[PDB]
Amino acid sequence: IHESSKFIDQQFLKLQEIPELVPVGEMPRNLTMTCDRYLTNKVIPGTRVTIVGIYSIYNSKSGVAIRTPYIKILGIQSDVETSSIWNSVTMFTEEEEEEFLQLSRNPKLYEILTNSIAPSIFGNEDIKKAIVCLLMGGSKKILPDGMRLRGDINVLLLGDPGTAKSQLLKFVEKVSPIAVYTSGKGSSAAGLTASVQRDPMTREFYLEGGAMVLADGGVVCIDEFDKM
């Protein structure tokens, strides 16, 4: 009787070993994992995790008495947390609010925030001011006629090689709450802009990736902007 029955959710995960430490002539090995209740939908594919769980057995219908191993997930810990819109947090503690307001009353806030931008890069103070203005951004608009005017700033840095432009890009990528560092032709296997491909399991259109959609509400640092 389904109307009086209680159900929960269950998820299957597939975990591979770290591809950095794999023998060159071997396909990397993976394990199937089962989680349930509040352990489901806690991770996204691609993140690096530490799994506590029961190494256990199932028989799947190559050896007369052979069994396929799997992991009963009991807890999930994430080593690093990726930055996105849905992974962003907007709640703030009260002491952090007091500290942020106390910082803003400093009349030398412009100088400290320009000096804190890449302290290891000598010179280029106006570029550091540009970086601060880039990081703050402007006021977004929703006008009554429906057309919107953007508040985000675009800064181009072109010049001779060996002048810490790439280092400034890397620092902006490291300091931003959401940021993607990419080249003009994209990444090794991560495309630029927006890539719509078919789902590998259902053959249906979905947004696979791209630097400008993964970094919505953030900064894309595009090195080598000319080759594109």
Ligand X SMILES: Nc1ncnc2c1ncn2[C@@H]1O[C@H](COP(=O)(O)OP(=O)(O)OP(O)(O)=S)[C@@H](O)[C@H]1O
Q: Known binding site for ATP: residues? A: 159-166
Give the angle 174-87-153 at the CA atoms, nearest 5°: 50
Measure the CA–CA gap between 168 and 163, rounded to whole angstroms: 9
For ligand X, the closer of residues 34 and 124 by Cβ is 124
Enumerate residues 6+ apart whose C-beta is below 8 A from 57: 67, 68, 69, 70
Measure the CA–CA gap between 73 and 225, rounded to whole angstroms: 45
Contacting range for another protein; rule: CB under 8 A; set: 85-93, 131-139, 140-148, 168-176: 168-176
Indicate which of Mg ion, another protein, ligand X, none lies near residue 104 (CB less than 5 to 8 Å, by partner kind).
none
For another protein, the closer of residues 129 and 165 by Cβ is 165
Pairing of strands 205-209, 195-198: antiparallel
Does 163 help bind ligand X (rule: CB under 6 A)? yes
The gap from C-alpha 143 to its chain's centroid, in whole angstroms, comes to: 31
Structure tokens at 214: 């993964």
Indicate which of another protein, Mg ion, ligand X, none lies near residue 73 (CB less than 5 to 8 Å, by partner kind).
none
Contacting range for ligand X; rule: CB under 6 A; set: 45-53, 64-72, 99-107, 164-172: 164-172
Indicate which single residue of 113, 132, 195, 212 sits in contact with another protein (rule: CB under 8 A): 195
Contacting range for ligand X; rule: CB under 6 A; set: 7-15, 58-66, 157-165, 181-189: 157-165
Tokens 């931008």 correspond to 117
Count of residues near Mg ion by CB under 5 A: 1
Return the residues of window 209-228 that contact ligand X according to CB under 6 A. 223
For ligand X, the closer of residues 107 and 161 by Cβ is 161
Indicate which single residue of 122, 139, 145, 156 sits in contact with ligand X (rule: CB under 6 A): 122
Give the angle 126-185-220 at the CA atoms, nearest 5°: 40
Does 166 help bind Mg ion (rule: CB under 5 A)? yes
The answer to whether 187 and 226 are in contact (CB under 8 A) is no
Indicate which single residue of 86, 161, 196, 203 sits in contact with another protein (rule: CB under 8 A): 161
Contacting range for ligand X; rule: CB under 6 A; set: 6-14, 115-123, 139-147, 200-208: 115-123
b/e string for 54-93 if b means 16 or more Cβ within 10 A? eeeeeeeeeeeeeeeebbebeebeeeeeebeeeeeeeeee
For ligand X, the closer of residues 36 and 223 by Cβ is 223
For another protein, the closer of residues 92 and 122 by Cβ is 122
